[PDB]
Write a protein that binds this ligand. Sequence first.
Ligand code: HLH
Ligand code: HLH
Lengths: 204, 204
Amino acid sequence: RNLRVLLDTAIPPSFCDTVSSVLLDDFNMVSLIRTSPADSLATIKQDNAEIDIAITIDEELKISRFNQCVLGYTKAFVVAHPQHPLCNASLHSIASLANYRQISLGSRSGQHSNLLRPVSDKVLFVENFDDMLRLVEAGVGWGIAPHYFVEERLRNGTLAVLSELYEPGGIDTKVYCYYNTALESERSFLRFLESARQRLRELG
Amino acid sequence: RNLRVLLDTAIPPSFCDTVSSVLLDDFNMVSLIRTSPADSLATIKQDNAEIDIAITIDEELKISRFNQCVLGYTKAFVVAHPQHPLCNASLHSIASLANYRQISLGSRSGQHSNLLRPVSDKVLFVENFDDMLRLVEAGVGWGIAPHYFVEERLRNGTLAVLSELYEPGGIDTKVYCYYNTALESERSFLRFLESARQRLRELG
Ligand SMILES: CCCCCCCc1cc(=O)c2ccccc2[nH]1
Ligand SMILES: CCCCCCCc1cc(=O)c2ccccc2[nH]1
């Protein structure tokens, strides 16, 4: 009995180490699959992907063949080159973010949800977060990326934060867990959440 | 110069005491207005309401004449009569919540956002949270209400919680602050957030 799991690129590696660790105690065949958060909800809807669990930040409660629950929380920031014109982080900057270029991720389906849809009118899409930060480091525009994708570049001064005025301490983001309805009965999955969650709580 | 503020019924009174307290230090005319969270985003869009600040949990970033920011967090639960059939709180209960009657709030505009839209197909609307809990205490159905609306009834056993399986510790919910673009310049508003937030942080 194989178990195909989905972890988007927005899941920090700490979360990743916790998921894989537990599943191996009861399940003996686990397939980890990485996807862009814009393509997470899309790939699980595919009838042929046969995805059994998915751990993404994207929001969509009414999904067929799937339930929803929360695993933990994680921070994300609005980054930009330290010399970007909007570097002032002013209240007018938070509002005029929709007037400058944003570097959001591209959806293989061309569709974005309310959470991940680009907020700005001038947008430039990319494939993964790696390609985003490169363009952001070059002052091309601003974007929203996880904390672990940016923790290093900030201490090096390579990037600057602008969301503090919007949400201090970073944009707390929910990490949902979509699980096939067939697993709601098997107690092996029950033990997974109680363990995966209790460990993520120890992080903070 | 009058200042019309909007606090939905989902804002716990602790949040309410903090908002009113600060505004009186710099502003000398403040009008507090309460609304149903389903009618919060709707009343600010009214050209005649002339609302200057709004503090609600409802999500809608692309609003004309308004910006957005986060003030704090608050918990909400899925409540039900302790003898409700779904009292088991099982994984099948969290999924079958869409099959039983829900007691959600009614929108004066008839429209609900992604956050507040009733998740279940069998729905029964009400005007405020007071009318919800009454019906919930009578085993009519389940609903989602703030923590301060339910903190008393739980210790009395009058209600039971079901969201622990979905999100332990309660459904952490963001409390946004919509402020008119005209206030982004006045430093009086700047001092409000830095004060309103720093105090809400002391709560937890
Ligand atoms: C000031 C910005 C508005 C608030 C952000 C909107 C929600 C949101 C949009 C994102 O692309 C994103 C990307 C990675 C992690 C979380 C994210 N969350
Ligand atoms: C298992 C339930 C799904 C998650 C809840 C959906 C979001 C949500 C829906 C609500 O009506 C609500 C009411 C008051 C405070 C917060 C709320 N939040």
